[PDB]
């Protein structure tokens, strides 16, 4: 059920990591590969501790081993974008998230931060805040959910949501370790809870301003994969890991601006929802790395989900595409929640689409090539 | 056998838990679900350490995943009531027990603290003290008592009560860990002992004044479930876990007022017992989350138990419904013990009934609405 | 071969035991049950650390669960007698050895300390010293000696006495842990050695003055049982655990008075041995909880043992019932050793008989009712 | 999951069973014990093969060991009633079903065949025919259904009914062996099929005239238990072995007389249905060995069943209490089916109640005396 | 739990055992060893099949290896007494039960057949008949009953007597093989049944006239041990294999003569029982190979047993020392049953004591030392 690497003696490893480091510093570079969903990493040694992200040098990798580059001109380039403390090696070592560029310095096909950053800079005075709810499922190496009966199923759903106890919550050791690692690293983690499906979990990131939302979620995803690797289990972001009467996985996105958060900001919330109602197909394509096919296995209109074909909005409606919390409606200010994005969405795509539709008043089925 | 989660490498988890936290603080919210027996929890991040319960924010959860609300209006609200230190994450993180309210702010069906608190405030000058003896059995994930022979039975009862040794006491590691965690958290745990059935244990909570009795017992129950989850075993509060000639599980409740604790207070003890003798059926219904059916499997008048049908009382009588300790009768002051409540009773329901019958002079089969 | 409780993750338990305790203090009460050989225990919480044994309150327990009372009037009472530091929970927690009294305050049937203490007060000016050598065998949960071949036997005796090495000494981890725990608790442990039988061991307690010999040996027995519970093995004091050509288990008792320890004290040693020669049957009955039946399986006159029904004494004779060490005989002062008591003897019975015969000049087959 | 006896080398047994018997003949005596549900057996040696049941001698057993008598007059007696060929020992050995009588030669409490034979003799010319469909569940020795995932569940119902394949039929080896064993013995087995719940099966016995129905069903149950003993699994007749969304087990009874089998015999069925409608409570009590404490957990009105408190009828209605097959109504001739009795019913009780209600026109809550 | 030899491939052995033997004949010699309750065997080759026991040659063995002699005149001799067909090697191979004689041609100490045969010849004209019920317990090689839970107990007694099913009968494969093996060999086996304790069984031998009773029972015991050797389990004849509330094992002896079997033979039974009442202590000593130190742990006066120190008799009284069947009393002819002998009794000793007291009118303490 668990990997062979996780059966090695971990006490031996801790003895080596107790050795004082000395003067050199380790930096781990992290980037998104050609599938748009996977992460890659490698480590270099630095002479001294970097104080800001601008002090880190550019790097490179062979793009033919990541299905990102052609044959002859295979070299790709890494440009640091955000820096965090490394929870796996501790201070003064760092984690570095990078943008990917081709040999001719054009952005890579899966490099979506480059365009999203420019869009964020166009509306910086409105101070957009984002909050994302990442759902995932812990799986054994055999392709079955962790802690499930072998070749079988646990009891029916209902007691597992926010559950406590040996027979209710599976794999809380991973969840606790991931929570503390994110806090140490500097990732803005807001909370966690157990989900309807046993061995299914959720963590919230935010509220984050502008481009930082995508950076924090991607690094949080990397930390989860690396923590699960220590325990020998697999975390999956597939929207429908188990077919049938078992809960799916999504990534709800909460959105607000400076105008929405002030008194009588509910008026501006309703304006944005009206604009979103006219671009349902555009956001479905942008909320999936495959264009909507992945989300079709999840958004069928059952198990507290909305239909993939129809747009709906309402106050305190958890079955609609867009939900206004009851407290927000009562206080006439706050935010609203988009429940359409799938659990494997790219945050840079999702946040860029929301700004384009709601703040830049874009129409049609294509993004505006220059600005808005 | 134990759960798959308990076979993960716990040394790995402690490495992550050793990371310094930083400035943010974790708060775990805890509430009682729609069955009136189970507990639920989830965690949010706070900006700074809360000093009192009054400065924690309200929260919410989806009640359709806990069988507490219907479809359209499913949002429920959490209101903090009592705060303790978190033994699983250590200072400055907190545990928060909450009351549950519906979407229209009316109390939930299983929210019995709201009415119990008002009753306790009616008799605050009499200073009621409660002491509760919680019995439970440790279970394997296969539904059999922990440490019992597979598909079989251990030796006859008699050597397991207050026992010591590998062949006499099963699961003392859980008991020791639970005791220390409660002391750290601030729960008023008074003692523990091994019970007549092997793998059966007991811990005592009190003496607690007023509404704080229910708060301390529920948090103690939560800590036990969470501790057992680490070891991979299940703690059950079922009154009769094993049929036949094996000891059952109850929750004895000790009761005293300021008048009973003073000299010649035995007179007021005798008066309260007389009032209790006239309301046997009312207390049987209130001492069970199912109206008394659960307690029928345990209270059959055998193995040092009282009859479910009959009321009896006496000094130093462990076979009666109400027992006056021999010391209390000798010093003519003290308290008395109600031995009827089952091990899965709700403390808020049990304590409210005692106040209504003994201090508010209520009669009939229904509680008196507003005042007494 | 070992218990299910011992396969739980002990690292998890140590995390909880690392939590700072706070202001409250745990006290474990220990007493002897109705079989005269087994120990019982339970824990209560105190508000502050007790400084002397007189500050601890009286307690009680249900005697019908320990075969010490039946029917009505089954409550028993515990009176603290001696206090030690708790090695399992560390300072400021305490272990408390108690005397048992029935509901009418008469001493219980197996409470032999009450009479033994009064006898020791009658000879206080002679300062009797006692030293006892407790032998025991470590056993697996399957009823076979620990580390022995399954359904088989190890090699013949001879290399195991005071042995070192994986093939010579079984279970030294328990012996080392028990030694350190006794030193921490304050028990006057004098040494240990491996015995002729593999997995058989011995520890020495003393020299102890008066009634303190019984208190120290009983607490050492409890500590041994509790330590073995941690490792998942059973320690047995049965005189002949394995039938045939395998070493038995005894409890040799060394005795001396102030006159015996002074120069030319060998004269008073010979006087006491002369008195002992006339009361062989009386001491055989008092050296066993069954009146001598258990010791019959051991004292057959083989394997360096004396005959059960014959009395003998000599200098440097290890086959006699009473042995005078050669050093003592050469220096004309010291002590002497009684080799008759079985390994499961009650120390209060053994010490009381020695005082009555040697210092109070009692005759007949019954103890003198009043003083002397 | 399987018994220790099933892990013995079965090839060794087959060698001994191939030895020629000689001239002696074995005979196995079977009778119903004091619970009214289980069976008991023992073997004796006869000098020659009996040609009919009337040549078998009487026997006896100890009734105190079977919970059928006290210690004063414990002896009970066995009178053979029906003979069958032995499928476990082959010819010329026999199985004999016996009636149980007290020491005073009066029928035992669970001996329901005596009165049923007397009742059935009174309607001989009508030639009543019976056919019963017996359902059962195969269980491992751990108390879980055989082949189910450990501490878990298989997929939801729907593919298991009459299924074929490793993932659809659990334990067909037992079913095939039982079918062939019954045919060899002379049991009138009509067919088998796999049931809705996995590891649940059904066999049909009949049409058997008169008292012969109870003899054939009881022997078939004994053969099933004995066959399952060879494989090491347990056959259970519980009405609801698994709680929840899983099918229960019943024993449908098919009834017809000569009149209903003749031309236009459908009209004689209608009076039988009409007569049965007024005695629903009386028949429910006689359809359960525990008076209704078992069938109450199956007849819940769901899973295509009928409610325990309501009587229904109709042509080709499987949800009613009584079903008339569609072909029977089309041909206006045949039988009708009673779906009320549980799987653990006594066939003698069921057949007697049907005869005395539809053929003797009995009323009231008590069986008629010599008047009927 | 089973022997290493039983895990060898038994299919390989059956291949060799199917080879045609040829003209040589195997004969196995069986005799009782120096302990008086164990058996020994040895095999030799004969030129042709013996037609009767009288043409089997005498043999010999080493008595020092069997502890029936010292190292000076260790040689002993075997004289054939009874011949049986070999069930383990099939025809024409044979089993031979032999008497043991010293080097000086005098009977061995445990050779009780020699004197018993002379006693039977004295009263041969009355044709005494004997029938013995031999009880035994099946054990694993670890010293625990076969099929019992590891280091534990099954459910309480009551369903195991004459039970059927995987959870009620333990090890019926051995019982079925032994029954068929005895019939093939010519042993007069009368029947079998399961006993009160699980894994405990019984078989009956008789009615056997005179000296043949001891021959048939001893061969039956040998066949059981040899059959159990094939399966890898141990059959024990200990009177009290498991201490506590678990049934013991005895060897009930049924006795009758021609007068008792004739008309009005009940009056002759009363004389024998009256004569038996006087020599209770004499028979108790002769009913135990250890003189009474084995049967003392069974005849406790509980679990339907008679106290070893009390003689009692009565019609159909299973708690008495002597039982008269109810049918015998009603028919005034038959036999009577002696319930005193233990399971490990010597049939020659038991049958000789019954003849001496009831038929020869002997009295006193020691047997008559001359023929007349
Ligand atoms: N003003 C805001 N602007 C943007 N995001 C916000 C704002 N306020 C809160 N959020 C984010 O909204 C999210 C709240 O989601 P949470 O999981 O706590 O509740 P929920 O949506 O009611 O739950 P569920 O999982 O049942 O849908 C968090 O990620 C938080 O950071
Ligand atoms: N004055 C008091 N008022 C209320 N509760 C009290 C008072 N004094 C003590 N108690 C409570 O009474 C309980 C004592 O019960 P404990 O389990 O120690 O003994 P017991 O009832 O005699 O034992 P058993 O488990 O055999 O019934 C504790 O929970 C304690 O807090
Ligand atoms: N003066 C004394 N009075 C009483 N006891 C004493 C005195 N001096 C020593 N002792 C005790 O005598 C005991 C000696 O036991 P020890 O195991 O050393 O004996 P040993 O001679 O090696 O014998 P063995 O081979 O039987 O174990 C110790 O318990 C010690 O405390
Ligand atoms: N005339 C008859 N009288 C009595 N019993 C009959 C008669 N004809 C057939 N039977 C019996 O009725 C039974 C028919 O059961 P069967 O399970 O085959 O029917 P069904 O309608 O498919 O049942 P199910 O409720 O399981 O779907 C058989 O045992 C058969 O012997
Ligand atoms: N006339 C007789 N003389 C001697 N033995 C006889 C006679 N008739 C029968 N027997 C033998 O008596 C034995 C009866 O044993 P069986 O177990 O059937 O008796 P039971 O009364 O049921 O006793 P229990 O309940 O104590 O086992 C058989 O071995 C049988 O051969
Ligand atoms: Mg959420
Ligand atoms: Mg959400
Ligand atoms: Mg208590
Ligand atoms: Mg109590
Ligand atoms: Mg020593
Ligand atoms: Mg010594
Ligand atoms: Mg059918
Ligand atoms: Mg049917
Ligand atoms: Mg018998
Ligand atoms: Mg008998």
Residue numbers in the entry:
A (entry chain A), B (entry chain E), C (entry chain D), D (entry chain G), E (entry chain H): 2 to 373
Paper text:
Loop conformational heterogeneity was also influenced by nucleotide state, as the filament map with ATP only displayed partial density. Taken together the E305-loop is sensitive to nucleotide state and also by filament state under turnover conditions. All maps had similar resolution range (FSC0.143 between 1.95 – 2.27Å) and showed defined secondary structure and amino acid side chains in helix-12 (266–288) and beta sheet-11 (313–316) on either side of the loop at similar density contours.
